[PDB]
Design a protein around this ligand. Structure first.
Ligand code: ZN
Ligand code: ZN
Lengths: 222, 221
């Protein structure tokens, strides 16, 4: 069913749209969340192996998504290898750190061999222009459609130096709100100019952040 | 052929057809005016309604939302009833201590053995009911059936607290069949004047049957 962020299709109503979106309102391990209290722990290191690839940018009406038709771009964590399937954006951010909403947030969606999803999240602070995002921003479809990127894109450039992260379990922030998703939110933020965030919104048609959900029985580790 | 006005009013139903004789001779007729009750430990209601493809119908006596497919159920005491349809009455048919409400909704269920169960929701005059808007928008003004294209979840029409009044009754329209389980929710929902009047206009008149004596029945709450 059609769903959105405004009108009668807003996040508060996703569960009433179709029986398949039921977990959006009944789930107890939903995303995004407001990270306030955390438990300090010895978290395992992240091994990222991204390479210049043949990707295609897409405007699906909900976000601007960069699709990877093939494998080869991976993330290894605690012995398990996850393959990057796609990455997209949210303006403003969905997850919050101590009540702070960020200008933008990127979600790098991965899937392991058993099809278990893992999302790596990057938060952006308001500031200097990001040239690393220009290659995608300049070809950004202003309307619903896909555009093949002529030059190979290297997602490695979109990741910080230090890969320390916050770890918790959650779900997809969009319908059907499937749970069983591991979330790794990077502690080191990147940046964007207020104008970059603005062009995004204009292309999508509205802010596309889902409101924060209750942590419930969950503990966030840092 | 029956109605609420003209020569075929509720008070005459039993006289207009041998098939409608129970409307005048029944001792366990609905609706009723709930005044005196017996406090008892009633079983909790388990409602399992979901977004479904339904059709809206103006049959000349009410505005009805039909469910051709199964999947929407109500469970009480291990028994499971499947929602067949829900309709409305303006003003309400049942009363609580002499009080008639602006509107009343009837959710008609049937179990494996075709035993009818009616869940009733009463509405007070208040703010605009936005959860009824979708149905109200496509509401056929003339006798006819229209298939609501977007899915409708009847759970949005029910309050969080499901306490209810329990008594046995009948259908409130001919042939006034008895053996009907009635569960009237204690918590009220709301509608505005416009919505109520809009309903009367499409149906063509007030469609509430006058209250019937309880006789040997007792209402439990
Ligand atoms: Zn996302
Ligand atoms: Zn009725």
């Amino acid at each position: 069913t059609h769903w959105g962020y405004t009108g009668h299709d807003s996040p508060e109503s996703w569960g009433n749209l179709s029986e398949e979106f039921r977990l959006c309102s009944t789930g107890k391990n939903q995303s995004p969340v407001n990270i306030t209290e955390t438990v300090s722990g010895k978290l395992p290191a992240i091994k990222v192996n991204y390479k210049p690839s043949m990707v295609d940018v897409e405007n699906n009406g909900h976000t601007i998504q960069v699709n990877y038709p093939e494998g080869g771009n991976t993330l290894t964590v605690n012995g398990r290898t996850y393959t990057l399937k796609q990455f997209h954006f949210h303006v403003p951010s969905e997850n919050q750190i101590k009540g702070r909403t960020f200008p933008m947030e990127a979600h790098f969606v991965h899937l392991d061999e058993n099809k278990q999803p893992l999302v790596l999240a990057v938060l952006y602070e308001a500031g200097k222009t990001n040239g690393r995002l220009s290659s995608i921003w300049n070809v950004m479809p202003m309307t619903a459609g896909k555009v093949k990127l002529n030059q190979p894109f290297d997602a490695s450039t979109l990741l910080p130096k230090r890969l320390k992260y916050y770890r918790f379990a959650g779900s997809l922030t969009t319908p059907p709100c499937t749970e069983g998703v591991s979330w790794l939110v990077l502690k080191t933020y990147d940046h964007i100019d207020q104008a970059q965030a603005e062009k995004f919104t204009r292309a999508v048609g509205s802010e596309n952040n889902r409101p924060v959900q209750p942590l419930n029985a969950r503990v966030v580790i840092e």
